[PDB]
Design a protein around this ligand. Structure first.
Ligand SMILES: CCCCCCCCO[C@@H]1O[C@H](CO)[C@@H](O)[C@H](O)[C@H]1O
Ligand SMILES: CCCCCCCCO[C@@H]1O[C@H](CO)[C@@H](O)[C@H](O)[C@H]1O
Lengths: 764, 509
C-alpha cells in the first residue's frame, strides 16, 4: 500500500511546518496509504520481495521496480516491440536501431516528466541508518516517528543482505567488516527485538563473528565514539578531540578554514559532544545488552591502553607514528586538565562558538544539511542544548525526507541526486536524434525545472569570512534547497544549457538570459589549482602532508580536498563548446585556463595507459571524460601525445564478445582487475564506447564497434530498459554508490551518436 | 638522528655543538675595522630578533613553510630564555659530551678524510675549541693539503676525490672499444690491480652497528678506500667492470678475483632497496617525503631525507642482467624478484614528454641513457613495447642543425629542458645521446641520423688529442654544479668503440 508522490506538504507534513525555496522543486516524499489495495497488483509486492530474497547471492543490489511500477498505471503506454536480436555478424541498419530507440525512449521519457526530472536513488550501504535509529531512541520520539509497519520493513531490509559468514560489509557488496556488523546488530537489537538463533533473526549467527574478534575494541574511531554516547563504550577508550580548534586568529598552520568542509561540519558536533562529555540515559535495555557484547566484564577492564587496537580487516590507511604520538600526548595534556579543573572561559567560549556556528550553518542550509550522519548528530547536538525549541522540531520534520523503499526493505538515502541524473538524461535525449520529435514537451518540462533549480541567492548572513566560499549563480548536487557550490554539476548544467540554446525557440520554449552564464563562468574560474585542474568546493588550502592526521582508518584523503580529473574534463569541454556560440567574455583568460588545464591531464596518466576516477568504479570511467575533454582542443590520433594510450588500453582489454567489466575491489587496489567471470555490464560498455567515440575511431576502424553495439541489443528487455543490476559507483576509494537510471541513460546516449558518427549503410 | 640523511647529520652536529657552546672567535683589530663597512647600519645599534626572517628574492629556491617558521619562532623563545641564563647543566653537558664522542668515533673510522670540505673544516674547529693541544687536531691539520688543487686559473679546492669512478668509466670504455693494437693489456692490468686493491673489506672500527650507520661488507667508495663509505652507484659500475674483465683471457690481463667476494657485493646491493622499486645511495628507507618541510636551507632541495636514484637502479639492473650470462649461482628466486620490482619503478618516473632527468649530470637525457641501457637488458623491444619508444622519439625530435645535442645549466632546476644555448652542442652530451640510442637497437632500424651524429664528433677531435670543449657537465642537488675533466675523452671513445661493432658501415675505400 505504498504510493510514491511528490511532497507538496509544506504546511505541517508530519510533525512541524517547514519553509521551501521554490515551492518544493523536486521534494521527495513517500507515504504508506491506509486504504490502498488491488486483487492482482498488490500480489506483485510479494514477488518483488521474494525475487530479491532468493537472488541476493547472485545479484547483490536491486533496481527500483516497485517505484516505476506505480507509473505504469498513470501512463498506460502498452507498447509491444520485441527485443531486436542480431547474430552471426549480421550488419544492422537504421531500421532496427530506430525501432530499439522508439521502444526504449518513449517509456523512459514517460516514466516521470511531470515535475521535470526522474526520481533517482543513492547506494544503500547500511552505514548511516543506525545513527538515525540511535537518535530517534535517545530523543524519545521513536514510537511517534517510527510506525510499527516500518519496523517490519527495516527488519526485512537488514535480513535481506546479511553475509552468511557473519561479517557484514561497509557497503552493500562488502565482506567481513566490524563497523557495519556491530552497528547493524546494535540497531536491530535496540528497536525492541529479542535474541533468537534462526535464519531470519540471526543474532546468534552474528554472536560468533562478534566474539571471536577481540570484542568490540577493534572497530574504527567512529564506532567507539558513537557507542560511548549510548552507554556502551567509555570516553577513555577513544581518542581526545578537544572543541577548542575554532579559537585562533587563523594564522596558525592548522585552522578550521583549512580542513575540508565535510570534515569541518562532521567533527564539530563530535567536538561539542566530547567537550560536554554527554552520556545518554542508561535504560534497562542498555544494562542487559552491554554485557553480551564485550568479551570481558563491562566495568572491570582498562581503557587508556585499549585506545590503539586496530583490526586487520577494516584497516586501509594506518595511523602514522607522529599522529599516534600527538594523540597520546594530547590524552594526558587535556584529560587531567579540562575534566577536573576545566578552564571555564576557554571551554565556555569554545562551546558557545560551536553552537553559534552550527546554528548559523543550519539556517543557511534550510535544515537539509549535507549527510545523514551529520544531520543526525546535529539533531542530538541541538537537542541536548534545548529539548524544547523550534529548530529541533524543524529538524524532526525533515527526517522523512531521507527514507526510501526498494525491492528489499526500507533504506536511507544519503543525499539527493535528481539534478545530476536529470541533466544526464536531458543531455542523452538531446544528443539522440529526435526521430518522432514528440520529446519536445518533455524537454521543455525538464528545461523549466532545470532553470528553476539554479541557486542564485547568497547564504543568509555574513557568508564571507565565515570559512565558506562565495556562491553566485551556482548549482548543487541534490536540489536548490541546499545552496552548496559544486563545480562538477555546474559544468554539465552549462553544457546542457548551451546545447539547448541552439534549439529552436518554438519547439522548446523560452531561453535563459545570456547574462546569468557569466556568473557561472566566474564561479568555475574561481576554483582552480596552481598546477592545473580544479577541486569541487574550494580551490586550494594546503599541501598533501595534511592527510597524515587522518583519524579514520577505513578511508583516505578526507581532511583535505584534491583535484578531480572528471570535473576538469567537463569544464574544458564546456569551455570549448562555449567558443562556438559566442566569444564575448575574457578571450585572453579562457585560453589561458585551457592551457593550464591541458598539462594537468597528462600528469595524472599512469604508465599502463589509463587513469581511474573518484566516483565511478572503473579505471575507464574517468578515461571517457578525459577523452571527451582532450579531443576538444584539436588533439588528433595519428600524431598526438598520450591520445593513443587510452585507445590502446581500451582495445587491449575486452571480453569474449567485446564487452567490458570490472570489480568493486579494482579501484581500492589500483590494479584494474576485470576478473568478474569475464562478464560485462551495459553501463560500463556504454561508457567505453562513448569514450572511444570521441577519439575519432569510427572512421579509423569501426569493426570492434560492431560487436560492442551488438552486445547491447540482446540485453534490451522486451518491457523496456536493461535488467543488469550493479552499484556502478565508488565513494572515496572504499565506499560504493548506486544509480538506478544509469541502466537506461547511457545506452541511449551511445546509440544516439552511433548512427550519427558511422552511418553503417544497409538497404535491408 | 637515525632518520635524517647522513650528510645533514654529520654537518649540523658540529653546528649544534657550536650553537650550544655559543663560541665566538677573538675580535682582532681587523674584525672591528671590517664589521662597519659591511652592514648598512651601525654594528651594535640594530635589532636581531625580528631580522631572523628576511629571505632574498635571488637566492630563494625552496621557501620555508608556515609550520617550519612557527616551529622556529616557538623554539627561539623556548630555548634562548631558558638554556642561556639558567642552562640545564645535566642535559646540556650530556648533549655536548655525546656530540663530542660521536664526532670522535666518526672521524677515527673515517681516517680523518671525512666527507665534505665544509664538514671537515667545521669539525677541525669543533675539535680545536675542545683541545687546542692534542693529536687529533694535528692529524686533521696534516690532511689539509689533500684538497687543494691547481688548474689554468689560480688554486682551487676539491670537494672530494673521484679517481675510482673515472677510472672505472675509462676501463669500461677501453674494454668496450675494440683492442686494435692489443697493447692496452699492460695498462688494463695496471688499472685492474688497483681496482682490486681499492675494494673496502674491513668493517668500521668499533661498534659500527647500532650507531646510526649501515653495515658495509665488501663495498666501494666514491673517492678512495681510505674513506670507507658504502655507495650503491659506484659498486654497480665496479661489478660490471669486474664481470666484463672476467671473461677476458688470464694470460693477457693477469690473475682474477675470487668468485666468493662478489656475493658480499650482491648482498650489499640487495640490502639497499625501497618498498616501491629502485634504491637509494646510502640507506634503504627512513621515512616519507613529508620530512623535507623542515629544510633549513633555501638554496637547495631534498637535503634532510634521501631518495631513490634512477641511474643507480639502471646500473644495478644492467649489472644483474650481465651476471646471469656468466653463472646463475646465488638466489635464483630473489634476483628475478628484484628485477621485477625494479622494472615497474622506471615506468613511474617517466614524464609525459617522453624523458626523465637525472640527479648528477646536467641533462634531461643523462638518466635516459642509463634507463635505456637498463631497460633493453630484460628483453624490452622497440616495435612492440611500453615506454621504450617514448625516449627514442624524444631524442629524435630534439637535435641541432647538424644532429648534435645541447642543454643549459638552468634546464634541470626549472625542469623544462631548455636547449637554447645558441643551438650548439657538446661532445659529452652527444656521446651520451648516441650511447643511449644505441641500446635501443636503432642501429639496424634507421642509422641515417647516426651518420651525422658520428660526423659531428670527428671535427671536434684535436690534432694533439682530446676534445677542447670545456663545460661543467654536472649538477649537484638541482642547484649546485660539478665538473669532470676526463669526460671529454672517456665517452666519445666508448661510443666510437661500439659504433663499428653495432653497424659495420661497409666501405671498401
Ligand atoms: C587569573 C587566574 C585565575 C585562576 C585560574 C586557575 C586555573 C584555571 O583552571 C580553572 O580555573 C577556574 C577558575 O579559577 C577554577 O574553577 C579551576 O581552577 C579550573 O576550572
Ligand atoms: C635536583 C634539583 C635541582 C634544582 C635546581 C638546582 C639549582 C639551580 O640550578 C640550575 O637551575 C637552572 C634552572 O633550572 C638551570 O641552569 C639548571 O637547572 C641548573 O643549572
Amino acid at each position: 500500500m505504498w504510493k510514491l508522490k511528490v511532497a507538496e506538504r509544506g504546511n505541517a507534513p508530519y510533525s512541524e511546518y517547514l519553509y521551501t525555496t521554490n515551492d518544493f522543486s523536486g521534494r521527495q516524499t513517500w507515504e504508506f496509504d491506509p486504504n490502498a489495495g488491488t486483487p492482482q497488483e498488490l500480489a506483485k509486492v510479494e514477488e518483488a520481495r521474494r525475487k530479491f530474497t532468493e537472488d541476493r547471492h547472485t545479484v547483490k543490489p536491486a533496481s527500483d521496480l516497485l517505484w516505476m511500477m506505480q507509473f505504469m498505471r498513470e501512463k498506460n503506454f502498452k507498447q509491444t516491440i520485441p527485443p531486436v536480436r542480431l547474430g552471426e555478424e549480421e550488419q544492422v541498419t537504421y531500421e532496427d536501431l530506430t525501432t530499439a530507440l522508439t521502444r526504449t525512449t518513449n517509456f523512459f521519457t514517460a516514466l516521470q516528466a511531470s515535475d521535470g526530472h526522474w526520481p533517482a536513488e543513492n547506494g544503500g550501504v547500511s552505514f548511516f541508518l543506525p545513527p538515525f535509529i540511535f537518535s530517534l531512541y535517545i530523543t524519545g520520539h521513536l514510537n511517534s516517528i517510527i510506525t510499527p509497519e516500518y519496523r517490519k520493513e527495516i527488519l526485512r531490509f537488514i535480513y535481506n543482505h546479511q553475509n552468511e559468514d557473519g561479517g557484514w560489509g561497509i557497503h552493500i557488496e562488502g565482506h567481513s567488516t566490524m563497523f557495519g556488523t556491530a552497528f547493524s546488530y546494535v540497531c536491530l537489537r535496540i528497536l525492541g527485538i529479542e535474541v533468537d538463533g534462526g535464519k531470519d533473526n540471526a543474532c546468534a549467527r552474528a554472536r560468533k563473528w562478534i566474539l571471536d574478534h577481540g570484542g568490540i575494541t577493534y572497530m574504527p574511531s567512529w564506532g567507539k565514539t558513537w557507542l560511548s554516547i549510548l552507554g556502551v563504550y567509555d570516553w577513555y577508550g577513544c581518542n581526545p578531540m578537544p572543541p577548542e580548534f575554532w579559537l585562533l586568529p587563523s594564522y596558525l598552520p592548522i585552522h578550521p578554514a583549512k580542513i575540508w568542509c565535510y570534515c569541518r561540519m562532521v567533527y564539530m558536533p563530535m567536538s561539542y559532544l566530547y567537550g560536554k562529555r554527554f552520556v545518554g540515559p542508561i535504560t534497562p535495555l542498555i544494562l542487559q545488552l552491554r554485557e553480551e557484547l564485550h568479551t570481558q566484564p563491562f566495568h572491570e577492564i582498562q581503557w587508556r591502553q585499549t585506545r590503539h587496537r586496530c583490526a586487520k580487516e577494516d584497516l586501509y590507511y594506518p595511523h602514522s607514528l607522529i599522529q599516534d604520538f600527538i594523540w597520546d600526548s594530547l590524552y594526558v595534556a587535556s584529560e587531567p586538565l579540562l575534566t577536573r579543573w576545566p578552564l571555564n572561559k576557554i571551554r565556555e567560549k569554545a562551546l558557545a562558538k560551536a553552537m553559534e556556528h552550527i546554528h548559523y550553518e543550519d539556517e543557511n542550509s534550510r535544515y537539509i544539511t549535507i549527510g545523514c550522519v551529520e544531520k543526525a548528530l546535529c539533531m542530538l547536538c541541538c537537542w541536548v542544548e534545548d529539548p524544547n525549541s523550534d529548530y529541533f522540531k524543524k529538524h524532526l520534520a525533515r527526517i522523512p525526507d531521507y527514507l526510501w523503499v526498494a525491492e528489499d526493505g526500507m533504506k536511507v538515502q544519503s543525499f539527493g541526486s535528481q539534478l545530476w541524473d536529470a541533466t544526464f538524461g536531458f543531455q542523452a535525449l538531446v544528443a539522440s536524434n529526435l526521430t518522432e520529435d514528440e520529446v519536445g514537451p518533455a524537454l521543455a518540462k525538464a528545461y523549466d525545472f532545470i532553470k528553476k533549480s539554479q541557486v542564485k541567492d547568497n547564504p543568509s548572513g555574513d557568508f564571507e569570512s565565515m570559512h565558506r566560499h562565495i556562491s553566485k549563480g551556482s548549482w548543487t548536487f541534490s536540489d536548490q534547497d541546499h545552496g552548496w557550490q559544486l563545480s562538477d554539476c555546474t559544468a554539465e548544467a552549462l553544457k546542457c544549457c548551451l546545447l539547448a540554446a541552439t534549439m529552436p525557440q518554438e519547439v522548446v520554449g523560452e531561453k535563459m538570459k545570456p547574462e546569468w552564464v557569466y556568473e557561472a563562468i566566474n564561479i568555475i574560474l574561481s576554483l582552480q589549482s596552481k598546477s592545473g585542474g580544479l577541486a569541487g568546493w574550494e580551490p586550494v588550502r594546503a599541501g598533501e602532508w595534511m592527510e597524515i592526521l587522518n583519524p579514520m582508518e577505513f578511508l583516505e584523503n578526507i581532511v583535505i580536498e584534491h583535484t578531480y580529473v572528471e570535473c576538469t574534463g567537463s569544464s574544458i569541454i564546456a569551455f570549448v563548446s562555449l567558443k562556438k556560440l559566442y566569444p564575448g567574455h575574457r578571450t585572453k583568460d579562457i585560453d589561458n585556463f585551457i592551457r593550464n588545464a591541458i598539462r594537468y591531464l597528462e600528469d595524472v596518466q599512469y604508465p599502463d595507459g589509463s587513469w581511474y576516477g573518484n566516483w565511478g568504479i572503473c579505471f575507464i570511467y574517468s578515461t571517457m571524460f578525459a577523452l571527451g575533454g582532450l579531443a576538444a582542443t584539436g588533439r588528433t590520433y595519428d600524431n598526438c601525445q598520450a591520445v593513443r594510450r587510452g585507445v590502446d588500453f581500451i582495445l587491449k582489454n575486452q571480453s569474449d564478445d567485446g564487452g567490458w567489466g570490472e570489480s568493486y575491489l579494482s579501484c581500492p587496489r589500483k590494479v584494474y582487475t576485470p576478473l568478474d567471470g569475464r562478464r560485462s555490464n551495459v553501463v560500463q560498455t556504454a561508457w567505453a564506447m562513448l569514450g572511444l567515440l570521441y577519439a575519432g575511431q569510427a572512421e579509423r576502424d569501426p569493426t570492434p564497434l560492431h560487436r560492442g553495439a551488438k552486445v547491447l541489443i540482446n540485453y534490451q528487455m522486451e518491457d523496456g530498459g536493461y535488467p543488469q543490476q550493479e552499484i556502478t559507483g565508488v565513494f572515496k576509494m572504499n565506499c560504493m554508490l548506486h544509480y538506478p537510471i544509469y541502466r537506461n541513460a547511457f545506452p541511449i546516449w551511445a546509440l544516439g551518436e552511433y548512427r550519427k558518427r558511422v552511418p553503417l549503410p544497409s538497404k535491408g
